[PDB]
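Subject: complex prediction, re-run

Hi both,

The earlier run crashed halfway through, so I resubmitted it with identical inputs.
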Amino acid sequence: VRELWFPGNKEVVPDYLDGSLVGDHGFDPLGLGSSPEQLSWNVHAEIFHGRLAMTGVAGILLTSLLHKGGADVPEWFEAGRVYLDRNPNVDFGALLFSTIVMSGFVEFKRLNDIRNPGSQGSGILPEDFKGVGGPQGRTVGGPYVGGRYFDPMGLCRGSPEQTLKYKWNEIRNGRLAMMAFLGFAAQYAATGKGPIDNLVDHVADPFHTTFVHNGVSVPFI
Amino acid sequence: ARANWLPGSDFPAHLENCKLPGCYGFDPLGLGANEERLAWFAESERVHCRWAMLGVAGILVQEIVKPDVFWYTSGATVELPFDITGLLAFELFVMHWVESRRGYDIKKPGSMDQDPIFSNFKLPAHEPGYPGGIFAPFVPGSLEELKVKEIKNGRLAMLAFIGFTMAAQVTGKNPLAALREHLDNPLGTTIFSKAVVVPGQAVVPPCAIPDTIEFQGITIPAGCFLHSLWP
Amino acid sequence: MKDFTTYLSTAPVLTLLSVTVVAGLLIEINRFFPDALIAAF
Amino acid sequence: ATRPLWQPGVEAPKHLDGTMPGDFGFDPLNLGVNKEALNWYRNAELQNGRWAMLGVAGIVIPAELTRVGVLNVPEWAEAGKVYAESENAIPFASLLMVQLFLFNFVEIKRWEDIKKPGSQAEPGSFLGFESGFKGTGISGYPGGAFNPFGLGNSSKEAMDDLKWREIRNGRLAMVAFLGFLSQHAATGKGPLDNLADHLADPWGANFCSNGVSIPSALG
Amino acid sequence: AGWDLSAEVPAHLAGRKDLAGNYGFDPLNLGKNPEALKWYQQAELQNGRWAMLGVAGILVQELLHSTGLGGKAADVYWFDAGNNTFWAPKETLIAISFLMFNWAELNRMQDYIKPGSNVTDPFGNKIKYVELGYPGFDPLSFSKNNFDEWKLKEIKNARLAMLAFLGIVAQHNAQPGSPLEQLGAHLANPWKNHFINNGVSPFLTDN
Ligand code: CLA
Ligand SMILES: CC(/C=C/C=C(C)/C=C/[C@@]12O[C@]1(C)C[C@@H](O)CC2(C)C)=C\C=C\C=C(C)\C=C\C=C(C)\C=C\[C@@]12O[C@]1(C)C[C@@H](O)CC2(C)C
Ligand SMILES: CC1=C(/C=C/C(C)=C/C=C/C(C)=C/C=C/C=C(C)/C=C/C=C(C)/C=C/C2=C(C)C[C@H](O)CC2(C)C)C(C)(C)C[C@H](O)C1
Ligand SMILES: CC1=C[C@H](O)CC(C)(C)[C@H]1/C=C/C(C)=C/C=C/C(C)=C/C=C/C=C(C)/C=C/C=C(C)/C=C/C1=C(C)C[C@H](O)CC1(C)C
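This time it finished cleanly. Structure:
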């Protein structure tokens, strides 16, 4: 059929993970998405995590590249405290509350999309926020929300092959970005520098700058 | 067989049988796949071409007549007959009028064609983005050929203006000054000489335009696009 | 999954989970607001 | 039925139909499943909303008029003591008993309305005034001697519109009065004092800086 | 559509042509309810007529203040007019105005509730009546030819005057002096004297 996370071994989870979802390679060895309702929830979660991690990793990469040209930008792991210091008139509680309230508005919008797939493209919002559907055969809603506002440049309207290709690009880059952010957190814990700092340290001397030499991974060396 | 952006290649599909001028079958990313977006992007390209033509011509002439003024910094070092606040407000109002009219005209063709003040005056029917009439007094040659000529020149002008900006960032002098600097030593002024990266070292050119500037008290964060990302 | 969540809804597991949650909550309240003898408002 | 709801996408419960004024399908706690309880809650909401509109008016309007420079009345929290210390002031206990004795009569009348919405109109009740208590078929909307100007007393749907305006304003007033109470308990300043304070430094002066809202123990 | 080309008249303003100065301008649909629009037309007429009166008063009295013709009465700023003594104190003037306007505005309101029922005076004098907001007060009868054109002139000048009064108060709070004083101040440069450079309006600039 398609490519599997394990060539051969067709004992991939029973056909709730057939070659239908975008990014589907039969990887569910722990069965966390077996039932269809949980599978739909997991598809939403994976796309959202991929997009959010893509945003976060791009921000971390750029902020760590600026922090190497000497620009007055802190590293990603100290940006919160650095900002709180440099802007003393702001209250942590206020910023945390505002972030939770403004994030909450849009996340309730997305929640009531998940509950009723087409219910959010009406009332105050126009009709483009109704969603184009996608996975599980739904033709409305979903993690893919077309229209002229979330897809302003029309890069998935027209040419179904092009839409599928771009969907695959998004999903694979999202999985890569999630793995990359896990790497960022692990490298920061083990070494204590930025991501670009670690990359240039490694390329400057490829040896003696592996994970063995940081003294935290291989704990005894 | 026909004119191609890459001889030997085939056109996509939307770009096959264009009615837009300058169709050389580009779009390696599929932005013109849609057909409303294709017309919107065609108008955007035309206005970008014309604004960049005006910009590059103005920069060239201003450099020719006033070589002691850096075009990049000339916004703040020029001595305006008026103020800068009211000048920008006048700019804002006039451009709002004309640009809103043009944008609407593109949105719906048979619309922004009638003079408000004088009822009798009215633009004769035109294709989008080519008003003609009062806007086109003299027409030197066949219209389609001249549209192709305009599109070619506009492409070259937009590339030239981005080059102007970049040379101003890295070299710090006006375009013809940079050309004279490259012509006295062609081997040594190229970006390959000024900047280079290898595994273990990165040599990047400094930005001649300073980090900040002073203008009537306030400071405008005018740096160098994105330093550190330069090769 | 469905059967695993059904198992997590069983009285032996859900009761134990709820007792653990309530115990943890009382422990947290007493950790942050200790030695409270009266309802001082 | 197809009206806007408190949460777009969440359907209204099958007991909050769409007939009551101010109906947005908001009832997460399912307090109004019983029809009789729903009528009593409607009537309670009307009373709370009307008293809160009166109270919030008598709080902000004197406060804002004092601010600009007129009437110079105290701030609402201390206004009880400001009068209480006056010379010819009625004692608190006697004053409260006078108020409660009058409101006993008035509120038991309104109560006997709420039960059978034509109760108090029986002839022989008052001294010829009993006709003004006939009601208007719905509890909480007396009319008659009440509503002297006859506003909405015309097109039915006009009365329905004014009912939504009244209920929305009352809900706003009750939310605002809860705000006044919680703000004066935390920051011992007035409502306009808090307003003019927050606009000064919105990121510094808010509810996460007074130290009473967020528990000091936690932080 | 008239107020903004390529837009669309909001239906309730579309076929309703018997309104003065109808241009389809209603981005907020306050007038969707027909009774609401019937009230809002009267509100617009009252606001426009009172603002034409008020702005004419402001401009004429301040022009007299600047040039100098009306004496100690008019040699004050319009907003500082409460310092003049007059034949009465402020309080009795306010009381008299309450009484008189109660009379006049209740006559107009009774006209509104049942149009045409209140035209006759206690002495039997009977005036005519045409349209709701236009009681036919025509001593010189400028209303027999092109009446819609005259209503258009009235309403357009009324909208201009309400805009003018909003400008008067906004400028008075923003910059000091009489309105025409400010007009001369703008005409002085003008590229620096404009709403941007006050320290009161953008706020983004100079705190
Ligand atoms: C939270 C992120 C996330 C989520 C919600 C999903 C969700 C999904 N993935 Mg997926 N994936 C992810 C990240 C994620 N993925 C990453 C980072 C990679 C790169 C390695 C992949 C690679 C991948 C492949 C190749 C495939 C999937 C597939 C699927 C779908 C079927 C499997 C399933 O439902 O299990 C649900 C998974 C979870 C509920 C996540 C649970 C994670 C556990 C509880 C924690 C342990 C993980 C981690 C190592 C622990 C680190 C924590 C600590 C060390 C800090 C499903 C909708 C299959 C598919 O067909 O897609 C349609 C499939 O082919 N994923
Ligand atoms: C959300 C996310 C990252 C988001 C990052 C953000 C917002 C960063 C934000 C900021 O940085 C900025 C921008 C600026 C900084 O100054 C401040 C912070 C605040 C730091 C990554 C998730 C990262 C999530 C990761 C890495 C998840 C890995 C999951 C795996 C591997 C699961 C695999 C399997 O689940 C399957 C698929 C099938 C199962 O059956 C079996 C197993 C094996 C369980
Ligand atoms: C369930 C779930 C989530 C959350 C869902 C929730 C819980 C939504 C609702 C959230 C609410 C109501 C959050 C309220 C937060 C209030 C906060 C965070 C107050 C913070 C202030 C603090 C901690 C103290 C600040 C001080 C500072 C440092 C200075 C002094 O002056 C003193 C002091 C006041 C102590 C997230 C993670 C968001 C996503 C979703 O996917 C899963
Ligand atoms: C709906 C629902 C349903 C679902 O299901 C569930 C839930 C969620 C629960 C819900 C909600 C609820 C809520 C929100 C509530 C709130 C309320 C309020 C706030 C009230 C007040 C209310 C309020 C009120 C009455 C008030 C009143 C007031 C007053 C009189 C005042 C008085 C005064 C004055 C003038 C002044 C002086 O000097 C003082 C005094 C003496 C003080």
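Chain E touches chain D through two residues (CB under 8 Å).

- K.
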